[PDB]
Write a protein that binds this ligand. Structure first.
Ligand SMILES: NC(=O)C1=CN([C@@H]2O[C@H](COP(=O)(O)OP(=O)(O)OC[C@H]3O[C@@H](n4cnc5c(N)ncnc54)[C@H](O)[C@@H]3O)[C@@H](O)[C@H]2O)C=CC1
Ligand SMILES: Cc1cc2nc3c(=O)[nH]c(=O)nc-3n(C[C@H](O)[C@H](O)[C@H](O)COP(=O)(O)O)c2cc1C
Ligand code: SF4
Ligand code: SF4
Ligand code: SF4
Ligand code: SF4
Ligand code: FES
Ligand code: FES
Ligand SMILES: [Mg+2]
Lengths: 217, 433, 59, 230, 43
C-alpha cells in the first residue's frame, strides 16, 4: 500500500550534514577499484556501487554519506540524493542488525507467506516496518525476490532462506539472536530448485567436451 | 518422419544447462569437464559473420520475454567502427514474479555465461561485457565474480582471449532493488549512475546505448545458450520446437503444484504435460485447476479450459491471448481467490513503476485502487467496463512496456472471470444494504 | 429564488467565504463589480476591495 | 538538397533530416498539444500529451521526440490521436487538486486550456487524491507542489540554462516528487524564469500572489533598463 | 561419479566485502579503459 517513508530530508541531531562519516583506507582502495571499471570520461557511473559501499560500512546512509559520495565522485549532491531515494535497497534510516524481508507477491502468497509473516510477528512482537527495542531485527515486506520456486522465502542480510514453515523461521530467528549463522537456502531436504522428490530431469551423467560438436570446427 | 508434430520429451544429451541443480562443480574444472570453454579459439577465429550466421540459422529468439529474433538483433551491431567503443550488456535483473531461471544459470554454471559473453562480444565486435545482476543476488554475483577470476587467470578472457588475439573484458554491476531496471534502456541508465528510468526509442541501443556508445542488451539465457549453438550448430537447435519457435527453454513452475521446480524442456511442450510430468501435477488433481499464468505476472491468465491443449511457445500462447513471456508458470487451483491474486500483482506493478510517464504513473495507481475495491466488492458492475477502458488508455501510450505489463493482467481477469467480480459486488451490496 | 439586494457570506466559523477568484467580476454583464486582493497577514487569499455599483447592476 | 518529403494530413511538406513530427506539424500551422516539451530545453518525452497517429502504423508516436521519416502521413486529428489526448488528460487530472479559484495560474493555465480543447468534459475518478508537502526554495518562487504534473521543465531549465543542479526528483511511482530533498534556496540570477516555464500553478511568483487575473491585465510591450542587455 | 551431494556450499563463507574484494583482485587483469576526451560531461 502506502510507502510510509518520506522523500524529504529534515535535519536531525543524529542525521545532519555534520554527522561524522568517512571511508576507511581499505574502502578507499575498493572505491578506486570500482571507479577503474568505467571509461575515464564517465565517473558518475560509479555512484550506485560506491553509495552501496558506504551503507555496507555504516549500516545505513545519513545525508553526510551522500554528501561524501557526491564529493568523492565530483557529482552534484542532488544526483546522489535522486539515486538514494529511487532505489529501495538503500537505507536512509537506521535498521536492525538483521534486516528481515518477506516476499509477499502472488507466487509466494499462494504458498502461504502469511503464515511466515505472522510467525515472525509473533516471535519478535513487532509490526511490519518496525524495529525491535534491542535493534537486532528489522522487519519489512518486499516484492518478488527471484526465488518463487522455493516459496515462501525470506531474505536476511543478503542471505536467502527458502521453503519456510513457521517452525523453520522460528529456529532461524532463535539461532540468529543466539549469535549463530543459520544455513541459507531451502529447509525441506531440497537445497536447490529441483523437484521435491524424484529428480525427474538430469539423471544421466553429463557428457564430455567434444560430445556433439559439428564438423569443420 | 520430418516436421515433428508432438514435442515435450528430450533426453539429457540434448540439454544445454547440464548443471541446473548444482550437483556438479560450478568452478572452472567442472565446467571444462562438462564441455565448457572447448574450442573457443576456433569459434573466435571463425569471425563475427560466421557466429551471427549460426545464431540466425538457429532460430533463437530473445529469452528475456519479448521473443525478438536474436540473430537480427545481434547483427544490428555489425557496423564499421566510428571511434566510439562497443559494448555487450547482459541483462540479469530478473524482476518478473514467478521467474527463477537466470538465478540458477548464474549460480550453478556461470562459466557458460562468461563464454557466451565472449562469443557474443566477438560477434558484435564489442570491447567488453557488462553483466547487470540483481542487487538481491549477492551470493550469485560473488559466484559469478569467482568464475570470472578463474577465466581471467586461465587466459580465457582479457588480453588475447584464448589464442585468438581478441581483447575482451567482463564486468559485474549490481543493482539496488528496482524491477524497472530490468528494462534495457532503464538498465543502461542505471549503469551510468542515474535513476532507473527508461529512455525513448529511437535511438535504439545499437546506435546510442551505454555511455552513448553502441551496445546490445541481451538476456543471460540468450547469451548462455549461444556458445553451445555455435559448437553444435544452428540446425541442432532449430530441430527442436515448432517453426519460428526453435530450441529448448527453462521453465519455472510455481504456485499450486505438488512439486514446484525449474526444468529444461523442449519449447512446444504442452502445458498440461509439463505440469503433470515435472511439477508433480496440480494440487488436488488436474480437475482442481482454476487458472494458469503461463509467462510471468505480465502475461494474461488463462482458465483451465484453455490449458488442456495449449502449447508453451510464443505463437500458440499469442493465439490464446496470453503470450509466453519468461515461461514462468504460476498455477492457481480452485481454492484461490483470483481477484486477490490479480490485485496483488497490480499492487506489485504500482510499487515498481518508475513514475516517469503520466499513463503509468497515474493509471497504475488508479487501477490499484480500483482492484483493491474490487476485492471487497464495493464497486458497481459498470465500473468493470470503466476499468477495461482505463487499461486500454495505459497500454500502448507509455514510454516502456511496464504499463502494458500492468494493463494485461486486469484485461485477462475481466475477460475470463467477470461473473466472479459481478457476484462479489452483488454479495457486498446484499450484505451492506 | 428571488433576486434582491446583494450580500457577502461567511462560513460557520466566521471566516469569509470569498477567496477573491474574481469569477463574479469576470462574468458580470454590467461591469458592476470591482475587486482588489492581496495575501492577508496570515497568508490567506482575501479581498481588500469588493465594490458593487447597484446603479450599474441589472440584478 | 537533402530535404525529405512528409505529409501532414495528406499535405506535402519538405523538411530537414532530424526534424521531429511536432516541428513538421508546426510548419503547416498545426500546434501539437504539449506539457513537457519546450523548444529551448532538452527533449524529455514523459508527459505523453503529444501522441499522434502515423498512417498505416498501429502505435502512436511521441511527436516531440520522434524524427519524421520519408513518406510518413501524420494524422493530427484522427480518432486514435484524439483518444490518446483524452486518456492522457484524464490521467493528468485524476490527482490534480481542485484549486482553480485560489490558484494564480487560473485564466492563463495550459492545463485548463488543453483540458478545454482536447480533454473530456467530465470525470469518472472515484478515489481519493494524493497530497504532497510544500517546499521552500526562497522568497521569489512560491511553491505548491500538489499542482505539479511532473513535466520536469524546471529541472531541465535549472541544469541546462541556469547551470544549477539543485533540482531533481525523489522517490518513484505515484510518490515521485520534484524538489531539492533538503531545505535549500534555488537562488540564481535567472531563477524566476521557472515560474514562466512551469505550465501549472505549482510554481508561481510570490510578490505577484493573489493580486490580479490575466484577463484583467493590459499589456504594454517595452524594454528593460536594469542593465545594458536591453 | 554421483548425483548425491550439493556442490554450491562455498557461498556459505561469503562476507560483506567479498564482491568488492573480488573486484579489487580483478582490477589488475583488465585492459586500459577508453576515454571520451574529457574529465566529465561538465568539463
Ligand atoms: N526476464 C524478466 O525478468 C522480465 C521480462 N519481461 C518481458 O519483457 C517483454 C517486453 O520487453 P520490451 O523490451 O519492451 O520488448 P521489445 O519488443 O520492445 O524489445 C525487445 C528487444 O528487441 C529489440 N528491438 C525490438 N525492435 C527493434 C528494432 N525495430 N530495432 C532494433 N532493435 C529492436 C530491442 O532493442 C529489445 O532489446 C515482455 O514481453 C516481458 O515478458 C518483463 C519483465 C521482466
Ligand atoms: C519492466 C520490464 C522489466 C524487464 N526486466 C527484465 C529482466 O529483469 N531480465 C531480462 O532479461 N529482461 C527484462 N526485460 C525485457 C528486456 O527488454 C530484455 O531483457 C531485453 O530486450 C533483452 O532482449 P533478449 O531477450 O533478446 O535478450 C524487462 C522488460 C520490461 C519492460
Ligand atoms: S511505463 Fe511506468 S515504468 Fe515505464 S517509463 Fe512510464 S512510468 Fe516509468
Ligand atoms: S471573487 Fe466573487 S466569485 Fe470569487 S469567491 Fe469572491 S464573491 Fe465568489
Ligand atoms: S494549475 Fe491550472 S488546472 Fe491546476 S488549479 Fe491552477 S488553474 Fe486550475
Ligand atoms: S514544478 Fe512545474 S515545471 Fe517543475 S516538474 Fe512540476 S509542473 Fe513541471
Ligand atoms: S514471488 Fe516470492 S520470490 Fe518471487
Ligand atoms: S510533449 Fe511529447 S511527451 Fe510531452
Ligand atoms: Mg507556473
Amino acid at each position: 500500500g502506502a510507502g510510509g517513508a518520506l522523500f524529504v530530508h529534515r535535519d536531525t541531531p543524529e542525521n545532519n550534514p555534520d554527522t561524522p562519516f568517512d571511508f576507511t583506507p581499505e574502502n578507499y582502495k575498493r572505491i578506486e577499484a570500482i571507479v577503474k571499471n568505467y571509461p575515464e570520461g564517465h565517473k558518475a557511473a560509479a555512484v550506485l556501487p560506491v553509495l552501496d559501499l558506504a551503507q555496507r560500512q555504516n549500516g545505513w546512509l545519513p545525508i553526510s554519506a551522500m554528501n561524501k559520495v557526491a564529493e568523492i565522485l565530483q557529482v552534484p549532491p542532488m544526483r546522489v540524493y535522486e539515486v538514494a531515494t529511487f532505489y529501495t535497497m538503500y537505507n536512509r534510516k537506521p535498521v536492525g542488525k538483521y534486516h528481515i524481508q518477506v516476499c509477499t507477491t502472488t507466487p509466494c502468497m499462494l504458498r502461504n507467506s502469511d503464515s511466515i509473516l505472522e510467525a515472525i510477528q509473533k516471535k519478535l512482537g513487532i509490526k511490519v516496518g518496525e524495529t525491535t527495542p534491542d535493534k537486532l531485527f528489522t522487519l519489512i515486506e518486499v516484492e518478488c525476490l527471484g526465488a518463487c520456486v522455493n516459496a515462501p522465502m525470506v531474505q536476511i542480510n543478503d542471505n536467502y532462506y527458502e521453503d519456510l514453515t513457521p517452525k523453520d523461521i522460528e529456529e532461524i530467528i532463535d539461532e540468529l539472536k543466539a549469535g549463530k549463522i543459520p544455513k541459507p537456502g531451502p529447509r525441506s531436504g531440497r537445497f536447490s530448485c529441483e523437484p521435491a522428490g524424484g529428480l525427474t530431469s538430469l539423471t544421466e551423467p553429463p557428457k564430455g567436451p567434444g560430445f556433439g560438436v559439428q564438423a569443420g570446427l | 518422419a520430418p516436421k515433428k508434430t508432438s514435442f515435450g520429451s528430450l533426453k539429457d544429451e540434448d540439454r544445454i544447462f547440464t548443471n541446473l541443480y548444482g550437483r556438479h562443480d560450478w568452478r572452472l574444472k567442472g565446467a571444462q569437464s562438462r564441455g565448457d570453454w572447448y574450442k573457443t579459439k576456433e569459434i573466435l577465429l571463425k569471425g563475427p559473420d560466421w557466429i551471427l550466421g549460426e545464431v540466425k540459422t538457429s532460430g533463437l529468439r530473445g529469452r528475456g520475454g519479448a521473443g525478438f529474433p536474436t540473430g537480427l538483433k545481434w547483427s544490428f551491431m555489425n557496423k564499421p567502427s566510428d571511434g566510439r567503443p562497443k559494448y555487450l550488456v547482459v541483462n540479469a535483473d530478473e524482476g518478473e514474479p514467478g521467474t527463477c531461471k537466470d538465478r540458477e544459470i548464474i549460480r550453478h554454471d556461470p562459466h557458460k555465461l562468461v563464454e557466451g559473453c565472449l562469443v557474443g562480444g566477438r560477434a558484435m565486435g564489442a570491447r567488453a561485457a557488462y553483466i547487470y545482476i540483481r542487487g538481491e543476488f549477492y551470493n550469485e554475483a560473488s559466484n559469478l565474480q569467482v568464475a570470472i577470476r578463474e577465466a581471467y587467470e586461465a587466459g580465457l578472457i582479457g588480453k588475447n582471449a584464448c589464442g585468438s588475439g581478441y581483447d575482451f573484458d567482463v564486468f559485474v554491476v549490481r543493482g539496488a532493488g528496482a524491477y524497472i531496471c530490468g528494462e534495457e534502456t532503464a538498465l543502461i541508465e542505471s549503469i551510468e549512475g542515474k535513476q532507473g528510468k527508461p529512455r525513448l526509442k529511437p535511438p535504439f541501443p545499437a546506435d546510442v546505448g551505454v555511455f552513448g556508445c553502441p551496445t546490445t542488451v541481451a538476456n543471460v539465457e540468450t547469451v548462455a545458450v549461444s556458445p553451445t549453438i555455435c559448437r553444435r550448430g544452428g540446425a541442432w537447435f532449430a530441430s527442436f520446437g515448432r517453426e519460428r519457435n526453435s530450441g529448448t527453454k527453462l521453465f519455472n513452475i510455481s504456485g499450486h503444484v505438488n512439486h514446484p521446480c525449474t526444468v529444461e524442456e523442449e519449447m512446444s511442450v504442452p502445458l498440461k504435460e509439463l505440469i503433470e510430468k515435472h511439477a508433480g501435477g496440480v494440487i488436488g488433481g488436474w480437475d482442481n485447476l482454476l487458472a494458469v499464468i503461463p509467462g510471468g505476472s505480465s502475461t494474461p491468465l488463462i482458465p483451465k479450459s484453455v490449458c488442456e491443449t495449449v502449447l508453451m511457445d510464443f505463437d500458440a500462447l499469442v493465439q490464446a491471448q496470453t503470450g509466453l513471456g519468461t515461461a514462468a508458470v504460476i498455477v492457481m487451483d480452485r481454492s484461490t481467490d483470483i481477484v486477490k491474486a490479480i490485485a496483488r500483482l497490480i499492487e506489485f506493478y504500482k510499487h515498481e513503476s518508475c513514475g516517469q510517464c503520466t499513463p503509468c504513473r497515474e493509471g497504475v495507481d488508479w487501477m490499484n485502487k480500483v482492484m483493491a475495491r474490487f476485492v471487497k466488492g464495493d464497486a458497481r458492475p459498470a465500473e468493470i467496463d470503466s476499468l477495461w477502458e482505463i487499461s486500454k488508455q495505459i497500454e500502448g501510450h507509455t514510454i516502456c512496456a511496464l504499463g502494458d505489463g500492468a494493463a494485461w493482467p486486469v484485461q485477462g481477469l475481466i475477460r475470463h472471470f467477470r461473473p466472479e467480480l459481478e457476484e462479489r459486488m452483488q454479495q457486498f451490496a446484499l450484505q451492506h444494504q | 429564488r428571488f433576486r434582491g439586494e446583494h450580500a457577502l457570506r461567511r462560513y460557520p466559523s466566521g471566516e469569509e467565504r470569498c477567496i477573491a477568484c474574481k469569477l463574479c467580476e469576470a462574468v458580470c454583464p454590467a461591469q458592476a463589480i470591482t475587486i482588489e486582493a492581496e495575501p492577508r497577514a496570515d497568508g490567506s487569499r482575501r479581498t481588500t476591495r469588493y465594490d458593487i455599483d447597484m446603479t450599474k447592476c441589472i440584478y | 538538397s537533402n530535404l525529405i518529403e512528409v505529409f501532414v494530413d495528406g499535405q506535402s511538406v519538405m523538411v530537414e533530416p532530424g526534424t521531429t513530427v511536432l516541428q513538421a506539424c508546426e510548419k503547416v500551422g498545426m500546434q501539437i498539444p504539449r506539457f513537457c516539451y519546450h523548444e529551448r530545453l532538452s527533449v524529455a518525452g514523459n508527459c505523453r500529451m503529444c501522441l499522434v497517429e502515423i498512417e498505416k502504423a498501429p502505435k502512436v508516436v511521441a511527436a516531440c521526440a520522434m524524427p519524421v521519416m520519408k513518406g510518413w502521413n501524420i494524422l493530427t486529428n484522427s480518432e486514435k490521436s484524439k483518444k490518446a489526448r483524452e486518456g492522457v488528460m484524464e490521467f493528468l487530472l485524476a490527482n490534480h487538486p481542485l484549486d482553480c479559484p485560489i490558484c494564480d495560474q487560473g485564466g492563463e493555465c495550459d492545463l485548463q486550456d488543453q483540458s478545454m480543447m482536447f480533454g473530456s468534459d467530465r470525470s469518472r475518478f472515484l478515489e481519493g487524491k494524493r497530497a504532497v508537502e510544500d517546499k521552500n526554495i526562497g522568497p521569489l518562487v512560491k511553491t505548491i507542489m500538489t499542482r505539479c504534473i511532473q513535466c520536469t521543465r524546471c529541472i531541465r531549465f535549472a541544469s541546462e540554462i541556469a547551470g544549477v543542479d539543485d533540482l531533481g526528483t525523489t522517490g518513484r511511482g505515484n510518490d515521485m516528487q520534484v524538489g531539492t530533498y533538503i531545505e535549500k534556496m534555488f537562488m540564481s540570477e535567472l531563477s524566476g524564469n521557472i515560474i514562466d516555464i512551469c505550465p501549472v500553478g505549482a510554481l508561481t511568483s510570490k510578490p505577484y500572489a493573489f493580486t490580479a487575473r490575466p484577463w484583467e491585465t493590459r499589456k504594454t510591450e517595452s524594454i528593460d533598463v536594469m542593465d545594458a542587455v536591453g | 561419479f554421483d548425483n548425491s551431494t550439493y556442490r554450491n556450499l562455498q557461498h556459505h563463507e561469503y562476507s560483506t566485502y567479498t564482491f568488492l574484494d573480488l573486484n579489487v583482485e580483478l582490477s589488475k587483469f583488465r585492459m586500459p579503459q577508453p576515454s571520451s576526451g574529457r574529465q566529465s560531461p561538465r568539463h
